[PDB]
């Protein structure tokens, strides 16, 4: 005998799965009570999420909106849609010059799609290192030669570097390893580089070595879209973006590419048209992905209107200026920071002149509610031990933080540095050794207390602290 | 200035966003008012759409559970181990034999992650064509040459085929195409298959030409979970499946792979063990994906919770009995099934003896608000059947006598078609002067609607719904 | 101080080098001395030696004629020229419709070559499976998936096979494989198989799956040249061939593809020519080779003047003649042949039936001076030897010249089953029988007896070191 | 009716076939009438040219000695014993630490059986880029992108380069290249390069980043066999080489490889041992070639023996000291030699200072009976007109010249380029233009009746000048 329909299928979570509505609540408490510094994470609305969990997450969508391969998409073609307009407005592109497909489940299918679209296996890629700022996707392997990313599998990868010592990308030396290498492709974007990206430099080498150009602008997109930041579409054939990060929607990615005729080259004929938008969504479907996740399409047409608002702008002035804030409260006291300082949403903390890896940091700052990533770092060579600690604004920024809330997470951060040395010292520099310094340790305890005592100070979207299982 | 949190943050979606709103209430309504066949669609459950709904969609969470690339992981990490160890629940597997990823973002990404685990750019692979009813990711080109699936631009497939006078998976050429070719991977499941599959034969095949062997359980692998179909564990190195067809859950992937000391084999050394829980999570990530979607993570735990339950298994033999009840009642009226009938949750019929393209049925059912699809068969492009599942209309607690009822909707859809066929001709330019302002079309769009209407619908409260009407 | 010129750069060859000059005069006796059935070797023409060893060696010529990237090459050029023109003459082949590159440098290369001018690294491409007949150099995997050939490592091969029951290709499954893997390119031509080939039925597969057609025609090409087999210039698209198997001549490869106006097709545009010439004179050179070998250029184009006269005509005549004669030899002894007969020059005997592994029989046959190899035959150590007619041939051998060699191939055998059932079929056991045995040193004794009395070409036997 | 064995078969090449024996004879005079510069070039002894026109062309061999698959090997085998045994003993190596296949059909096919007998598809490799002084199989494509060797298609390749200013390898971007890209093998030995290697350094850049490091002396190998320059088994895992140029034998190759211990690194195991045999041997046959040219094996046999006396010795410092003493002549002249010099048997001349294609100089040197090659020098980009030639030593030291010998070379060189200039000046560097100045020049006429002047003072290899066909 079945279960009625109303005893499996209406019954909310809270009865279904006690344990993991315990879990959900554990972990909103989580988010609303500590300070949330991963510079990829965001909070998203209530609207977002209403869209996100919904009826949409039922159905199968294969094929692009009036070309299908199911019927019932009557309204899910709606919604895809006005996704993609939305989209092409919350980047102000013309929908003459540009194209864009929804349906990447994430930034990294969005971005193996793009690759997939443009290249054949085997063809060449030339990325930002990871160890100078950029993405896993963009090409990454590590310095002894491993493969780590299938972006280095499936493509040849030729990473470019920053300066060692300004940190600021060598274009020079990009230029020279791209007229050498000659990629297909080339990468810009990053996920820990603090400052902005010279694109029309980008396509000047593009050009001259005879590249694609991509800029990855998943991290800043939501600075882009609030025209913050330098606008990759004026110079790259094609941007890929997550959604979740400082654009504040749901996890998804998104592929723009251009349409209409080319510009003006030397060698190229007359009335050359893009021919783009054909692969890109043959390689999202039917080439890599399946059906569309549809709730994610429709969160995201939500999160590409917000992005669109008055009030989204402010939002993005207010992130940067958040994260510069917090950059020279860290300066101030020492702290060695990757070119000195931010010019977006995050800031890459060196630890090493402090003879301090990044899972340390990471560590004890969890122990204290306050969420960080170690980060790799110029010329490091542990991913799980860095030598840095990549600090963001956007979530917090979303919680209403303004600059001299900014620096006091710049205290806090300076307190539990200087606590995580401290234990060090004392304990020492073996992590077993270093984790016996994070039992019943009073100050641990103080910063954690004042920490929480804070976060509890600011509103949180995407649910009601009013209604949470667990209060304070 | 910035919004309040309380204006863009807490306000609910029919007010922040009224046209995407609607468009939802819109769907909802669509979904309750039809008869919803296709044979990868369900309705799941709103305890599953609550935690997809989540500020679980906030957390990076790159890594396993206590190894992680971020902090703030406590219970991400708890939420995951219990999804996984749910899994290898609703799956009747030894934790010490088994291990299972619960990372990928769907169906395709998790094929493609536990192929890029075991195999290096174009190894072989076989698995089922297609037009037998193979899935996409199972190395599909086409019979021009030309390359569809990404399994089939990284990796090298030749495709296996049913016996062309069957619609049997044809297990001798299965055998000699594999010691010809060599696949490094054989994999089998599908898509449209209506029968079982032999598994043990498939292990024969796979020892005989030194292939490892997957099962894309991902249409099945509700039936699997409540034993009413043979399990592919007894006898695939890897399983993989998707959670949002017959197990009902969200849209997401699984990787299932062997752990432990492997079976006596001549050459392997003693007490050697399986190694693919490294390569298949390496894989997963950082190798393809990136941050998991813990909102899928979290819904899934909730999915494979319920579909441990007796009445997920009395949902399960309910979705099969009510498969045979449909093709029996297409079967009496003299349609031809592939096959002639159906061991799992779908039914391929063959529209051949009729004269009529899937696409043909495929339009004129969504008319009348009954979604099938299209679907190749063995030999054909331009399909010659269509598919029809079980799943979805089963969920919304419809048994045999209904889903005659659905045969007999069809019955009248596909006699539609002909009479349409017949007066305005084979050429679909010509065809398409049936569908306008025929009366009988609307006749039988209301008749499925009045039907379809009545049943319970999981997932939200039809009192609460904008559009009753 | 330097050598005088003449005392290191011209004294002979006997004088500088008195080792190598003694190894070669014992090969040459080693030569006349035996039965030679190796069915890719021959015996070539004393003037095509004269043009091989020769200062043409000394030259760098890459490019074309009339375009290299050397200077000097005013006579390299019409040698080449020549030898070219000459290959499309002695293959009855329109230069209009027909090109050639004679720079491979052998028949590995010029395969290899080819592959690579039209097709990408990981393309499709099928050919006759090795153990159906098939060479190397037309793909070859292992059962555990090891890619043994170049062309399975750089390219994607599957082999098409035999019919089990006929030992003939299987013309249906090859069809069937062809649309089921949709190769780039389908390979004919063999090393081991005794039948001609239907390129007719080969080049509708072709069309069938949109594949190119190239036959591998370096066994039969001297039978080619003499019209005595079918032509695949009829309906491949490239043919390759060595230059030293049937045809005579140096080692050396040929790349022959078409030019011109393509034959009507469906979807085609009207006058549409054929591209593959730029794409395979790139592929030999720059891609893959560099300097030609112009003593093999100069070598070969003697070898096809030669091949293009009546007496070779008659050569390739006989040499089928010959391998018939003998396969009916053999086969009324009651030995099994695959096929049961041959087309060609060469016969694959089936040592199945016998209870024999081909490499018994090669080492007995090899200690008594005759000279075949153990070959895989379909279905199996391989289980048969191949057995050819050209070299004997050129020796001035007839039929019952061929039948007296299916004679000692008989005593071979027979004493091959006799020390099996003596020692063992073990090789560790089977060796032992090999050792002071009387009968093998008397068979061995009147092989020599036989052979020795034959002419010899390529060198003059009353000048060699060794006579007896 | 057949013919006769005696007819065919023992008829003399001048009876058989009077066009192709009218051609060698027409080539034998060109090759003793002239002054013949190609540095790649040289003259072989009758008693190589005897062993290669010999029964030795009947025999299929395949496999190694002792390991064959035909039977009928007993001297083939004593013959390519013979000639590895020699090739060791040529280089001065020992048995238990190097061993040598001998069966590659020339200096292309044993680079390409060397690198897949070691590379999987695609891996990477780094050589000495083309204008550099690089050979085509060290990874050759062109600065446009296009790849031009098979090394390109099947392997990733990305070159190193000599400096742009001095000419010399620039070890600094290889060792900072090679961390980069991280390459599977680095090849050294060039086709133009007119200096030393420090293959020490090479050994260190290589084991900095892990690779194999091979080298290919194809140009040097007789140099190296007289030990008057740097020896690459010192350093290299595997050496390469061509036997035609300078080591004066038949055209042919070989791959040398190390066997037994490896010498001690850290992270290796103990007892490590060398695996390069089995893989070297199996990439020559089965892989990639067919039957041996055992006719070739028995000349390079012979040219083994030959190279392994004191006379070759001898002959190798004087191609040295010839060369020299041409780059001399020529630099006092005011010409542009690039790196002002050279430590081998060549001279590599840019010719851009004077305005000039080494096309042109190419082809009026031809018309002088001058034998040149144009030749790419760093930073152009025609291959069919480059912007410079090269000039070699070697074959005109085998027909006995010496420096003085080489100083009226470079005079009549001086003369060639001077004449080129003159023929420029008056009808333009159009080449259609230029070729009209070609005709009836008297200068032309007196300059190549002096080159067959000075050329027919010298003895001849290979052949008797008195028994040639066409005399003076
Ligand atoms: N500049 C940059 N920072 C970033 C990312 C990035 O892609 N680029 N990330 C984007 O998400 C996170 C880091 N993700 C990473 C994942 C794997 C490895 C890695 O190298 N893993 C090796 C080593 C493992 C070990 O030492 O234990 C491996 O998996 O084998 C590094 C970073 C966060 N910060
Ligand atoms: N430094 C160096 N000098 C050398 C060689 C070498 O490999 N390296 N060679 C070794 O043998 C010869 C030159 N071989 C070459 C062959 C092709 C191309 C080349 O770039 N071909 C292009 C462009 C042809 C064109 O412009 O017409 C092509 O084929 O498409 C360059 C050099 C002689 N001198
Ligand atoms: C056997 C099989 N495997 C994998 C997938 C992929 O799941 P995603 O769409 O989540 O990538 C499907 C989807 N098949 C959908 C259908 O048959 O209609 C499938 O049928
Ligand atoms: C620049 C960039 N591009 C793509 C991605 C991939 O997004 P998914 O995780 O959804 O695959 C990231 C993730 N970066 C996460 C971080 O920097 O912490 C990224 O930083
Ligand atoms: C360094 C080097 N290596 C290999 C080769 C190839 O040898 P083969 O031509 O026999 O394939 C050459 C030829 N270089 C000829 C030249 O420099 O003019 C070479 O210079
Ligand atoms: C059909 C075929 N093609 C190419 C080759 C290669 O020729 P080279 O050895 O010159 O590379 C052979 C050699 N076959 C040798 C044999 O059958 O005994 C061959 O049989």
Redesign the interface.
């Known amino acids: 005998?079945?279960?009625?329909?109303?005893?499996?299928?209406?019954?909310?979570?809270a009865?279904?799965?006690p344990?993991?509505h315990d879990?959900?609540e554990?972990?909103?408490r989580?988010?609303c009570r500590?300070i949330?510094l991963?510079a990829?994470?965001?909070?998203?609305?209530?609207?977002?999420?209403?869209?996100?969990?919904?009826?949409?997450?039922?159905?199968?969508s294969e094929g692009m909106p009036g070309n299908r391969?199911?019927?019932?998409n009557?309204?899910?073609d709606?919604?895809e849609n006005?996704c993609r307009s939305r989209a092409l407005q919350a980047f102000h592109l013309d929908a003459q010059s540009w194209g864009v497909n929804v349906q990447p489940?994430?930034?990294?299918?969005a971005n193996?799609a793009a690759y997939?679209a443009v290249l054949n296996?085997?063809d060449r890629i030339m990325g930002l290192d990871l160890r100078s700022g950029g993405h896993?996707?963009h090409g990454?392997?590590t310095?002894?030669?491993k493969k780590?990313?299938?972006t280095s599998?499936?493509f040849?990868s030729?990473?470019y570097?920053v300066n060692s010592t300004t940190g600021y990308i060598d274009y020079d030396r990009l230029e020279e390893?791209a007229?050498?290498?000659?990629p297909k492709l080339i990468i810009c974007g990053g996920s820990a580089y603090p400052r902005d990206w010279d694109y029309k430099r980008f396509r000047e080498v593009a050009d001259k070595?005879?590249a694609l150009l991509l800029c990855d602008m998943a991290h800043t997109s939501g600075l882009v879209a609030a025209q913050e930041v330098n606008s990759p579409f004026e110079y790259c054939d094609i941007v890929t973006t997550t959604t979740?990060k400082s654009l504040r929607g749901?996890?998804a990615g998104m592929i723009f590419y251009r349409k209409g005729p080319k510009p003006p080259k030397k060698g190229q004929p007359e009335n050359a048209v893009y021919d783009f938008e054909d692969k890109i969504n043959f390689?999202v479907f039917?080439?890599?992905?399946?059906?569309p996740?549809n709730?994610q399409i429709?969160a995201l047409?939500?999160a590409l209107?917000?992005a669109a608002?008055p009030?989204?702008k402010?939002?993005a002035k207010?992130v940067k200026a958040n994260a510069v804030a917090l950059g020279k409260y860290l300066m101030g006291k020492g702290y060695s920071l990757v070119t000195g300082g931010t010019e977006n949403h995050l800031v890459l903390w060196d630890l090493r002149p402090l003879g301090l890896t990044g899972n340390k940091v990471?560590?004890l700052?969890?122990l204290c509610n306050?969420?960080?990533?170690?980060n790799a770092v110029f010329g490091d060579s542990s991913?799980?031990a860095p030598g840095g600690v990549r600090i963001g604004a956007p979530?917090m920024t979303?919680?209403?933080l303004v600059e001299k809330d900014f620096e006091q997470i710049g205290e806090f951060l300076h307190r539990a540095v200087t606590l995580t040395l401290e234990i060090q010292k004392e304990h020492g520099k073996l992590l077993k050794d270093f984790n016996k310094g994070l039992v019943n340790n009073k100050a641990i305890e103080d910063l954690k207390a004042d920490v929480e005592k804070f976060s509890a100070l600011?509103?949180?979207?995407?649910?009601?602290v009013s209604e949470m299982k667990y209060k304070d």
Chains 1, 4 share one sequence.
Not at 69 to 72: A, I
Not at 179 to 182: A, E, N, S, T, V
Not at 458 to 464: C, K, Q, V, Y
Request: some cysteine; aromatic content about 12%; hydrophobic content about 35%.
């Open positions: 005998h079945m279960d009625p329909v109303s005893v499996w299928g209406n019954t909310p979570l009865t279904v799965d344990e993991i879990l959900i554990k972990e909103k989580r988010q500590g949330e991963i990829s994470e965001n909070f998203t609305s209530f609207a977002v999420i209403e869209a996100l969990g919904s009826a949409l997450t039922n159905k199968y391969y199911y019927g019932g009557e309204y899910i709606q919604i006005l489940y994430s930034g990294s299918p193996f997939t296996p085997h896993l996707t990454y392997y310095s002894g030669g780590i990313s299938a599998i499936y040849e030729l990473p570097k390893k007229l050498d290498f000659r070595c005879g979740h749901p996890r390689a039917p080439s890599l992905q399946g059906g996740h709730h429709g047409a939500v209107k917000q608002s009030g989204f402010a939002y207010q990471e560590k700052c969890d306050i969420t960080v990533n170690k991913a799980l979530a979303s919680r209403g600011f509103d949180m979207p995407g649910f009601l």
